[PDB]
């Protein structure tokens, strides 16, 4: 997260870290056994780390649980990042408490101008690299479809939206992928892609979670 703030320990209790000997993507806990992340974050043998703030220090509220299953959207395309969504099943159910909690799925799609909370442990610089120990947060609005398409001609599908600030300085970045975009208490987006980070006229692009609610529920039911 570039241009954000320190969230505060366990203030985003649905945020998870996907770890392979190091943090590489975020995710969102949607029930005690399932996490939503980005398809491009897929790798075998992931450890999900819940209840984190400082990802480099044991502070007492962590739960580390192996992924037992990974379900990438059947129509994911790595070339275009269309359908950039994955479901992860935990090997054992997380113990839900004040620091480890599920985020609700949408009942309808969000609109342009709605303020959302984007969070993660990704890069805090747009030039060079500076990675935080503690969770960072950013308030950002959803952009109009037309502004999103103008920013990224030919690359925005109906399963994506743009959020952020066209003047630059505030955005998600490498290491935030898979993490949440929450609007009015609903998980509306997944961090996906962008040109650079926090660059003028190049907002963040996010998977449009509302398109996938029936697929998510069907997948949880059958796995």
């Amino acid at each position: 997260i570039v241009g954000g703030y320190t969230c505060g320990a366990n203030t985003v209790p649905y945020q998870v870290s996907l770890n392979s000997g190091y943090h590489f993507c975020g995710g969102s806990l949607i029930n005690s056994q399932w996490v939503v992340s980005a398809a491009h974050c897929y790798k075998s043998g992931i450890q999900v780390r819940l209840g984190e703030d400082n990802i480099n220090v044991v502070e007492g509220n962590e739960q580390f649980i192996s992924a037992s299953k990974s379900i990438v959207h059947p129509s994911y395309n790595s070339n275009t990042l269309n359908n950039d969504i994955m479901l992860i099943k935990l090997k054992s159910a997380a113990s839900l408490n004040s620091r480890v909690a599920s985020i609700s799925l949408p009942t309808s799609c969000a609109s342009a101008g709605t303020q959302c909370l984007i969070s993660g442990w990704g890069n805090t610089k747009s030039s060079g690299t500076s990675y935080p120990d503690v969770l960072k947060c950013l308030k950002a609005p959803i952009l109009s479809d037309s502004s999103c398409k103008s920013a990224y001609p030919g690359q925005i599908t109906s399963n994506m939206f743009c959020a952020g600030y066209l003047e630059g300085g505030k955005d998600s970045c490498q290491g935030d992928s898979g993490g949440p975009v929450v609007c009015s208490g609903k998980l509306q987006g997944i961090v996906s892609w962008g040109s650079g980070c926090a660059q003028k006229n190049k907002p963040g692009v996010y998977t449009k979670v509302c398109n996938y609610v029936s697929w998510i529920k069907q997948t949880i039911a059958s796995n």
Binding site: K43, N79, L81, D176, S177, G178, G194, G196
Partner: peptide, 12 residues
């Protein structure tokens, strides 16, 4: 296209 995995999508 530039995905936002760490350290990068290509660096895997």
């Amino acid at each position: 296209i530039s995905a936002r995995k760490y350290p990068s999508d290509w660096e895997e």
